[model samples]
Target chain A: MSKVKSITRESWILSTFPEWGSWLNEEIEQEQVAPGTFAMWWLGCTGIWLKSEGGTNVCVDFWCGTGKQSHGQPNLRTTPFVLDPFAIRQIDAVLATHDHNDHIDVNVAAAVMQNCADDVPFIGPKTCVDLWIGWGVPKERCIVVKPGDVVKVKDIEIHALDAFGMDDRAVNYLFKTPGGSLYHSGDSHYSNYYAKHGNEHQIDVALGSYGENPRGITDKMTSADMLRMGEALNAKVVIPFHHDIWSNFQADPQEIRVLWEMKKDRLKYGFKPFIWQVGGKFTWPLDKDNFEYHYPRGFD
Target chain B: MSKVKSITRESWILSTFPEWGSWLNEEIEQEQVAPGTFAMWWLGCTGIWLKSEGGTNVCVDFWCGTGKQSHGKLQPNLRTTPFVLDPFAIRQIDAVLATHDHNDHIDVNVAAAVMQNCADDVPFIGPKTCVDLWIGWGVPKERCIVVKPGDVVKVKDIEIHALDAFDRMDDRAVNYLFKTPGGSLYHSGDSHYSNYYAKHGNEHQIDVALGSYGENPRGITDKMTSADMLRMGEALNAKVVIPFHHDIWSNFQADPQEIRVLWEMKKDRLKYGFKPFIWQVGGKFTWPLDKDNFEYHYPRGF
Candidate 1:
């Protein structure tokens, strides 16, 4: 499955989703878990799926934009979506970071709501909840969580916090499961409050955006900014994300390594950087002594 | 020479400037003009050469960036530069727009050449810091036009309106909205995010939006991303978006193809409709741009 291939927008249009459509059921049916451990998979872009030790399956930002709102305009999906909407059998919660179509796909959200139990929570910021309800998700089932708010779904405890920006209602989440704690900075820039969040929580792993600003748009962070964030978060391991999934939002992940090498002394003591491959998975409590850092063979 | 090629950093590094180095003298010698005609060319990145019907040659943000201070950490020229210090070649510069003090946008060397040959009124217009830099480089103070946002300054056949670029760390940076014999064009400096586009559109008709597009992690002082650029262009009600600020520096550059695809995808959101005009380095383009369509053709021979 990890075979080398030249990925392009046309290839995505023709084969990616269809391939995922067929393989998804088989992958889901054969799911296996070990006690006292949680597994997480990178579904590309900002999407991730975490299956906790307590058998709770939570997906974060499970979205692939639609139509003109998607990557290669005219509404085509430039990359393969991670899974078919029908493949999700029992989602404990569908967590959205913001109302942006890329973060909260109306099509996917609608499908998840249609497929899930009425009690299943669709949690996000207020605007995200409103959009979900507008899309016909039962208003009662929508859980609106803002910064400094905590909500629980299945075995994971989610703490919402402000994602600093001028426009749009974006929120970062700290997911605390029985096995470990993970922080996901969803479409956020570097804010001083992040360090405060680090001080308050014991974060084992963190996922952040490593892309620098494009044309001076404060949409993403630079590699050095992420390093400062790593120190502020005080996490055991930092996994830089939000690159290579979309042509426009693409960043060279190796830039993080380059900056880290240049400013390693200024980084938090004993901090570790984990670069993940697209469409890959790894369990929490990453084995530090024997770990493979998945660097792209070619910088995208 | 018209052969289609996949342009890369390596192609730019080895061929562009060296090839231009030999061909430039001859090209400058063969320069032609016609009444009721206007021409433009991409001098790489944010630099543009605009020649009006009256033979007034004005340039917007004529720079290729200095080493180290240009692209953050390193100071290396990743791509071949388009122009050089042949005072004779730049004698036609009627005016120049220094959008800001950023080394990449304002080359003191190039400005000095323009100042020497062009008339006394070959105004160097921009914000205070930018004009100050021009003066510091020994450009005549009489030629300086310090522009505040919404201020208008005229030079020969051009009328420039300074649009607010409030989000950049340098308050002096500005987006020059130009009214020319060819048509109206908006040359965004190394700007931060701002909402002046729609207001500018409402105030006057905009024919082209020469917007900036790139991404850096330093959120505070970065240029507009594709979405922001698109929105700005759309708000201005511009018919075309020619994305600059890429393919020159090692950092803070965007692939024009990516921006094109994005524009193609987001056309539905556009009010007056939009098309992307991506020009090759040193390729001449016409203005008085067909209001309905936008296209470019390379020069015929060396």
Candidate 2:
């Protein structure tokens, strides 16, 4: 079910949430994260699109889809939305980190796979294998991997890593290519005490999960923990993920930026947090001086 | 609680099997067996309306209906099956038989006794002492009968006999009657044939019927089987025995046509074996031919 035949990027994600990259009503200014790569859509959930190395399109966790019921978006009938039936084909892979409903609703994954381009592959952990199998998806097209597994395809080497927060068996991803490396710490927390695990990975653009710490565990990493994890992981640029998706699941990425700057001299870390609104996309060849830091734009 | 407040005759029974009465579609009909002066609303399940000489309605064992999902008619919705509501008020009753005290039959006892605005005037009879206790709690000082070998009672001119029943205490529940001017009907309240029905089998000529025609003996299990329906049909010399009790449940239904075929085959030997009728809730049948005409209007309204 490749979306490539008549796919539009609008098909993938649509939401009413202003922070979501493709929010319908808000008039927020878009800042480029990298050349040829901009967060194209702010899916109500945690789906954002970007241009990876070699300008290959990648969609990570499409919970931000628009076809489902919306909580507050009443004018969806008239709202302009880009639905990419080929997104599954346009994108290199559909990455799922875990088995939680928000992260991996089987039907949502099936619907996306059914509409995406056939050439595009699907990637997830063993937790999603049964789901794809149940949806009559060919097992050959579905890739299941663990923390130590690495997928080197399409000029990008995606190294799976231990995302030690949600469940015991979940995974996070660190994507690396010739241009740069992006570390997506899928549903994980910053552990200063557990910094021993951070010694192995080197990240250029590090994304941390910042949501409500409901379990009093690694829910939202403290700003210091964020800095420590980023510095310890040898990350040159640290950004936060897993926030701004819902009314309750949000963290001030600017606060993490400020904390990193304040502790930069002491920690000998040289990285800045890049936070953007939903639907904003950036690409490589970034002008370090010219790159505008959109902090406290919605910062609390 | 009157169906007249909620439904009309636009409703009709539907089944692929043969039914007794000629309804909107005769492929299946809803008519009660003889001996029980019965009238019920077409609100899904088998609800028989028994009225006394004074126009007081006596509703026997109440049942919430099942539907096509359970292999039944797909026509009427369960709640809108034209049944009386929760506060089902009844005026008078000679008797209300909760035979064998099974959930299907006794649920009405629990509902009327526990729920508010429910009627509790009819004399209750069954095998269980719980029937007596439940009756003592209600208003009309109901007479409870834990029937066994031979029991008889007269409600006005109508004579009711509780014949001997058997095989097991649970299976030995009573089968009685209300001899009405319309016809004599046998209320075969859940019984399987044993030596008990054979002993008193020759006592009556059942013209109308209310019998269980649902099941066969499951690998010779000892519980009350529905085969006693045929035995009663034979021993009683009934002309037309309409099947009741089977309509309201998913598990208990016997194809009325099957029952008719089986009884018709056995009629020559028994000298009085009759046809069994399949009936919908509000269906009406004029006996012998067992030809049916479904009751079209709600008596409560029209």
Candidate 3:
């Protein structure tokens, strides 16, 4: 087991766009697990890069650009980015929850459009599709889905969950991979409908945001809210994202550990809470014989 | 025309419970304006009290209850409530729209106020369970407009129709679709995602959709997520989506600034631009909203 070395804050910030593309290149190569298994890497702040065994790679909310505030409002990135757009070589589809700059970075989308094979889908909500089309990505390349619609890319089925924000043309993605079902709560506040999603699909993993508005008044969810949602979804493993990424939109990943301690007994789903460092991979359906690394302790 | 005095924040917060009651009492009285005109007041949070020129007074989601957060969740009322329950202040109420069984959506004081003050036939419209609550509180059965999603009740010049919402459980809570001489409006009474919104849009043209936009996700009233609200507005082909159920309560309140950014960014995605019509708490606007020439000026700091 190798300990992931931490970089200085200055180096981290400077390497957010360029240096991290190589890191992703290495991670993607390392993620080629055995058949019937998949690996997912959290790219900080609501971004996830999931790679399947059959070489099907899908990226969701992969924003790695500089600061671009929505409507002149300041939503700064706190942590350094993990991947560069140029490093992305073979992506099957790029799914954006909304048109938020952090969720749908222009450079990332453009690079994905430019590099991927023709007819590779750039899937999102109506407004997000409009954004990509407006960015000169061919309208035919964009596939739009409402709350109930489903978009399929090769071996994966993407189910759109009704996400709660108005300007955030947000939609939660429930990916049914060959290995198992995974749900991504894309910036949605806690809703009872998630329980319905849990009952409907066998969710192996749920990647939801842990960082909420520091004010507690904005559109994000608290750590407690995320835990409640994880319980509702009946997830096998709950992974927290959207934390340690932005300055204003920040949350402590360790807070989930504290919350899990408080509520683990009552949790009906008995889903394991896994916190990985940015760029670390967590293999699903844990095998005791092939366990590779010791899970980090006390905020990594 | 009477000019409303602007109170200081300290006074505003302090007066939220009592002083605003008197102010509402006075404002309600003054609203009996000349014929052929109408006025609407946002009763803080989800409530909107609208009065027409033809003496038709309709109150939608007129909640006057104190502190009822769901599941013991701590959603504090950050701002003091703007108005109190004054049965005497309101003289005549042609109708009322109770969207759901939630206390904040259907207040007991409001029912008693309308039953005691208004004409005996003044109708209260809602689902069976909600209307039964009004009946339990002394409102006559004849005054109840018990309806399903498709049921339409015509009272005076206003036509009220029930629309579908996800929170519409067994009794079927509904969103009220009002067709008035001024224009058509759809008040989404706490809904989540439903294809029925698109179906409603195909049937009728909705001028404005009074939708909820905020972060508090309670099981009851805040069921309709922000994305659902946008889809509802688009489905109705609504010209404007005014975000309510905010700024009044601490826990249930949604940030208007977040709603604003979302609306602006995604406005063009819809068939009609889902413009944000965020008004002040006491801000009253005329009916038959002019979309082409409409501009909403939010108060400073919010």
Candidate 4:
């Protein structure tokens, strides 16, 4: 794991495609997340390992857990297959979106911490904090945060936003990196829960779950609602999360496309919705070359 | 339930065939267990209601036992089929032969006697004697042979031989019910057991148990010893009973059709080794009836 040194300006952060799922062996083409910022999707689940402009290595919901049962087929679980079991990288801090199995995955964490050390700071909801505490993470490292609270660590400002509609309590992660402000809404519905936190915080990059005709409330939300929610929060670049587990809970991106088209007249919000296949990477335009130089050095 | 009736030599006998298995239906014609004899086949088990030459109504193993839970289907534990349940012209039986429940013979005396009244003398072959004692009225016929070792009975010229190599310890007991038809031909070996140690001595490792348990010995009657054991007796050290007794067990001796059916039933239900070996029925069979003349009549819904 690399130390949390101050991030050099203008660094080229490459979005590693085929990180976890099917395209695991594919090349890592740098895709922009927010301007000058980058995030690589791990497996298909909600595992996002990102490096902001300020050299803050963030592993949000690192669910690379695998082979726990009789049906322990490796590729069956989340992607970005950790080809080397003993490989470890220094993540300055771990951000757990919530306490869901996919979000706070213990398998990947145990392996990762085994490769590295499990002493990094973990910012999550109350339930997530309780979980990591029980898992034996140090008390000082597990910081419980709720919506409306802002904590600044190094060059990154962490904002805890409300993640609602899950039967279990949770919070969305809003990272104000040097590149842009990115929000990761945990498994939740579009309710008044995150309205206050997100609207007040001027979010640049937003991530939310969108499905059509889903059985669970958070499992599905109409395109109109997504548009309405984005409008209500005024996000610049939007990324949809959730869906595509099985036939039962599949979300079609076409629905989002149609919903936005249908409500374009009423909802004046026009945001670019970037669809990233699991493990697909996104490079935002932020700190140009300094970030590029720092990333290779840390990776090397 | 109907009453049990028996017919002697001079009496008229009625015969009917119930649906045997899922394969057999009514359209087929039938034959007598012997010429001018009365019998029926109920659920594959055999029974007879015959009258002796002495004018005594004699019923042989009047089987009315219901089918057993073999595998998942309901099947009779015996080979008796085509049972009689009709209103007959004569009165009920004066005697009955309720053999033990080993093979194709029926042993339900209460059920058998329901069709015949003078049936006061229902003498069973082996453990069936318990039923007579349980009735408390004791046995009616004084000539009731409680077969132990040297038990004999004479229905005129028709002699009853007590061939008791019957497997005494299997949960289901087996016994031979032999009767000389015209004081000439004999039909006995139902529920026969081949001793694995029969050739060596008294006790040995059971090579293959026939008749009841698992696998049948492949070459049962190919050799003269096997043929003698099945039919001739003398060459195989079989005494008292002639080799004809073994012949009684198999009709064609070479066609193991019935044994195959038995084995199939056992395999499908009991999950035992391959179906039992079978043989064709009757040395003398006509076009209308290429089978045995065995009849099985029960006392229910005649």
TM-score of each: 0.55, 0.38, 0.51, 0.39
Model 4 TM-score on a 0 to 1 scale:
0.39
Off by over 4 Å in 2: A1-50, A65-89, A106-108, A165-168, A192-198, A212-218, A285-300, B1-302
lDDT of 1 by residue, A1-300 (tens): 454566768877767554457354355435565665667777766888887788788888877554356353222344565577666677889998987766888767777767777777888988888898888888888888878889987789999876863223778999998888889997787776777888788888888876533332456765656665777778777788776455555555665555455446632234667778655666777443223455337867
lDDT of each: 0.67, 0.50, 0.69, 0.44
Ranking by TM-score: 1, 3, 4, 2
Instruction: After superposing candidate 1 on the true structure, give the runs of residues whose Cα lies further than 4 Å from its correct spot.
Output: A1-51, A55-162, A165-171, A176-300, B1-37, B64-77, B80-88, B166-171, B215-229, B268-272, B288-297, B300-302
**Candidate 4: TM of chain A?**
0.72
DockQ scores of the candidates: 0.04, 0.00, 0.05, 0.01
Could you tell me which 10 consecutive residues in candidate 2 chain B have the lowest summed lDDT? B216-225
Error of 1 at A207 (Å): 10
Give candidate 2's whole-model lDDT.
0.50
lDDT of 4 by residue, A213-265 (tens): 32112244444345545665667666666554333445455545554544455
Candidate 2 residues B1-302, lDDT tens each?
77776554444333221132233222112233344243332223434545432333344555543345544343332232333333233323445554455544555433464334333434555565436445565523334556653566555545566654432354335556655545566666555434333344455656655655442211122222233455555556666555665555444433455444444444564454456556665544444334233222223653
lDDT of 3 by residue, A1-300 (tens): 343555567866675646455767666865665677877777777888887767778899887765556763466666665677776777899899987776887888778777768878888988999998888889898888778788878888889877764533778899888877778887766677887787777888888876635221345665556666777787777777777576666555555555466446644336667776676666666531231334345674
Error of 2 at A161 (Å): 1.4
lDDT of 3 at A276: 62
**Top candidate (lDDT):** 3
Which window of 10 residues has the lowest lDDT sum in candidate 3 chain A? Answer: A287-296
**Higher-ranked by DockQ: 3 or 4:** 3
- Give the lowest summed-lDDT range of ten residues in model 2 chain A: A73-82
Chain B TM-score (each prediction, in order)? 0.78, 0.60, 0.79, 0.41
